[PDB]
Structure 1
């Protein structure tokens, strides 16, 4: 195909992730594995605005920035199966750099991740997802982001985070399973000296000696900004109750976290309105019936998705 995944423009981030995954695959040496291609298909500058209640309380008094700048990225992984691309993994992230005001400085937030379970061989699928995620943490660490933030909430039945119409026998993990799955990924990263340690949001706030909501990171679309608006101590109660779902991941700790030079992202902006957050691709897939429910349909949908990405106005 003149519209292959591999022909999508390369990025340092995508190159870094795909090389990590394919090196994992070379080590495993399984006869059914096919080459993985990771492409960043959207990167744009955004700002998240403090909502009214929090603004009135902390912004207007000069205690908190009014908004926080970030870059959003969308990336996708593809495996070559039978000389045909298959998109099997996607993620959108929010990256708050070194000039972003506290509390958000040098943090990354994983907005959404999703998958379609046709990776071959099946016995390496989870392992490959973990390699992608560990790579992403490794990469942002190298650039100088200090902390990663992951929300482990599975989609409710019939809801698709990124890919329209999942396979009917692709089970959706319960929250306990997904939380353990993230722990498994983070433990591997700990072993590899990528992650220093990780904590749920309640344990984090406690160890941080947080006493004011103005000190919690404030991300676009996250649970916490909405919780904070309703509130306007009871907050600490709500952090305890939902603590299992919210991982705070320390990449760089202690003194080496405060002497850092500015973060320099070597990758350019990538305008792609189709991939500016998850809604537009779901809308396109719903309208054009790009389903991901069987290997065959997913390959066809992948091919259509690729054509769109290559031919974007």
Structure 2
């Protein structure tokens, strides 16, 4: 059988699905189906500091040339009338206790995506939030201190994870998506999972950040590109000065840009103050899960394209879910 449930379990996946199914049982809605959450990829990776920042801080011995992290891909499924439906996916970057600052004990959501067929409709958003809150709860348990979220909605005709969304599945505007994450985080705060959360500018300001080398540096995130762009801006400005003499600040730029886009970037403190400073090493009890299909989002989108796996109607998404689960089961076995 190539079911979602028969996908190999992990502690993380089991923690999340139990949280979700406990929630659903409390709601006692006759339309809800059993939810399955599976981690389908886990591997060690490194994020490499880009040239501009490398020249300025890395070659100086001030900053690590790269940061080690574990990427995980997980999916949530709802079984309904005996049929599997993949309705939520997320990739995360987890920087461990052995990671050098400024990244140590941080988690970053690379991206998340959904297709809006969860049944019942009235519990869909609540279920998304239970998954995200459960995730924050879990990594907090392991000893990660801080979560990071870029509230970036996809551009028109862009799919983060699932190929071909339903035409009538609306894409939230920035403000709506921002409020969505705030509602999730506020619930996590009420449950004493999250200590507090701030926009990136307020956080930087309070942490007394003085140098770009202090800003957490994640794979594919907004800020590494802002810093490269900024550093080339400084390079151009130096050029014009040289022109002025006839021989033809970074922290200021970063703070300006942070303030401009602060609403879009959440810094989430799981463990604050003291307890954060005398933590044991993080030991993740789940094994690595090699799965080339799910290392980052590109491979699955390509697979979907090639085999025509759309998630554009309930029935189409269920069929694509079968094809997805078949691919995952077969790539695993041999």
| Shorter-chain TM band | over 0.9
Q: CA deviation at 1:187?
A: 0.1
Alpha-carbon shift at residue 231 of structure 1 (Å): 1.1
User: TM-score with structure 1 length normalisation?
Assistant: 0.99
**Aligned pairs for 1:263-282 within 5 A:** 263-282=282-301
CA distance in 2, matches of 1:203, 1:285: 41
Question: How many Å apart are 1:82 and its aligned residue?
Answer: 1.0
3-state DSSP of counterpart to 1:312? helix
Unaligned runs of 5+ in 2: 232-251
Rounded Cα–Cα distance in structure 2 between residues aligned with 1:171 and 1:231: 34
2: CA distance, partners of 1:287 / 1:242: 37
Structure 1: gaps (5+ residues): none
For residue 70 of structure 2, give the secondary structure of its aligned residue in structure 1: strand
1:134-155 Cα distance to aligned partner (Å, 9 max, x none): 0000000000000000010100
Q: How many Å apart are 1:274 and its aligned residue?
A: 0.1
Shift of 1:169: 0.8
Aligned residue number for residue 93 of structure 1: 92
Greater Rg over alpha carbons, structure: 2
- Distance across 2 between alignment mates of 1:230 and 1:73: 29
Match of residue 106 from structure 2: 107
Tell me the distance in 1 between the aligned counterparts of 2:202 and 2:86: 37
1:125 to partner: Cα distance: 0.1
Query: Which 10-residue stretch deviates more, 180-189 or 231-240?
Result: 231-240
The one-character-per-residue Cα deviations of 1:55-103 (angstroms, maximum 9, x if unpaired) are: 1111111110010000000000000011000000000000000000000
- SS of equivalent to 1:257: coil
Deviations 1:220-261 (A, max 9, x none): 000100110111101111101111111000000111000000
Which deviations, in whole Å up to 9, do the C-alpha atoms of 1:13-62 show, x marking residues without a partner? 00000000000000000000000000000000000001111011111111
Determine helix, strand or coil for the equivalent of 1:254: coil
Provide Cα deviations, 1:179-204, integer angstroms capped at 9, x if missing partner: 00000000000000000000010010
CA distance in 1, matches of 2:52, 2:171: 36
Find the aligned partners of 1:211 and 1:128 in 2 and give their Cα distance.
40
Number of corresponding residues:
312
Secondary structure of 2:219's partner?
coil
Displacement of 1:157 in angstroms is 1.1
How big is the shift at 1:216? 0.1
The whole-number CA distance in structure 1 between the counterparts of 2:168 and 2:223 is 33
Structure 2 Cα separation of the partners of residues 244 and 50 of structure 1:
25
Q: Kindly state the Cα deviation for residue 132 of structure 1 after the two structures are TM-superposed.
A: 0.1
* Secondary structure in structure 1 of the residue aligned to 2:8: coil
Measured in 2, the distance between the counterparts of 1:286 and 1:203 equals 42
Matched, 1:24 2:43: no
TM superposition shift of 1:167: 0.4
Aligned Cα root-mean-square deviation (Å): 0.5
- Distance of 1:267 and 1:186 partners within structure 2: 26
3-state DSSP class of the match of 1:41?
A: strand
Three-state SS of the structure 1 residue aligned to 2:74 is strand
Aligned partner of residue 247 in structure 1, secondary structure: strand
| Alpha-carbon separation, structure 1, partners of 2:20 and 2:325 | 21
Superposition misfits of 4+ residues, deviation over 2 angstroms: none
**TM-score if structure 2 supplies the norm length?**
0.93
